[PDB]
Amino acid sequence: TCCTYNMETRMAMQSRQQLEGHTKDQISRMSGILGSKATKFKDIFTALLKESRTQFNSMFIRTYGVIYERNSYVFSDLFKELETYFANGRVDLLEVMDKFFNTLYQKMFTVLNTQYTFDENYMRCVSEHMKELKPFGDVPDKLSVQIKRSFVATRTYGQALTTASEVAKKVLNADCTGALTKMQHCGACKGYTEKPCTNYCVNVIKGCLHYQHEFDSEWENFAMAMDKVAERLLGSFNIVMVVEPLNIKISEAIMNFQDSGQDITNRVFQGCGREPILDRIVRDIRQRVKDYKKFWSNLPHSVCSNEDIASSSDVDGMCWNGHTIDRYMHSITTESNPEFMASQLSHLKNAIVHLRNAYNGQDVEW
Description:
The structure is a monomer. The chain has helices at residues 5-64, 66-70, 72-88, 93-112, 120-133, 139-169, 175-184, 198-208, 213-234, 240-243, 246-259, 261-271, 277-291, 299-305, 342-359. It has one domain. By secondary structure, the protein is mostly helical. The chain is 71% helix and 0% strand. It is built from 15 helices and no strands. The PDB classes it as membrane protein. Keywords: alpha Helical bundle, Hedgehog signaling, Hedgehog via Co-Immunoprecipitation, membrane protein.
């Protein structure tokens, strides 16, 4: 033997802080990029939603005049629900849209039929028949489903990014100590200058970070679910195509009532009687989430390739293998190491469930 007992104990602290150091570095930078981009995304969306509110109001004062001004609260209350949802997620978007178009129809029926008089009992009959008569055509039905799908998927995209960044921060083991020093510093113990075999170093580091094994496979499902949601956000659930021309979609529902106002009244009378910045940010995050899919499994390979360890290949047999200067005679482990959190997993598993519901156009309770 070429080392003492306390030389080995000194090399046990040096080997520990090298791996713990490199890991904490990679984790904090990834968690940093993910968290900062979550905030940027949430910012670009609130900006787009405030732009839509201002443009909606300006268009409506200009096109509808005092009919709009008198009832502006109906439209301003709608923007508040959409704002609150993105902030809280508590609002039921389909109920809100149903109520809005119901209120819009009652106000508009009364306005047109100034000539006639309607009490509380009459107007209740008018609302009961609304979905049977289709006053705004198929807009309320189609628009409400678009709002729900795009708002749910947009909010979940930002939330899942926040909780990924958060859960990575909480990841920040006795058997490792023995295998780590024996790999890094004990070649020299037998009077050797040869660097450790790469596959040896990889197996050792996989055993050290065996605690991130459950977590790594779930990070992969997370990246796969985050990629499907980004695909829907750029595609079929595109929120810019919903929010930006929202004033045009609502004016077109209004004109649908005006153009058939005569027809509507007759049917009632029988019943009762007398490139966008958010698209750029999604495309960007999407790529970074794709490049981070195998972040956890690449950690042993990242550690071994560094100037710090500078591990050598097996191919020539000129490396430290745990016994001598020879070829490391073990294959890399997959799915029992030859060289040898539950909350974070659940917080990540729940995010995946929420991303799945968002990509399926289903409800998210988060």
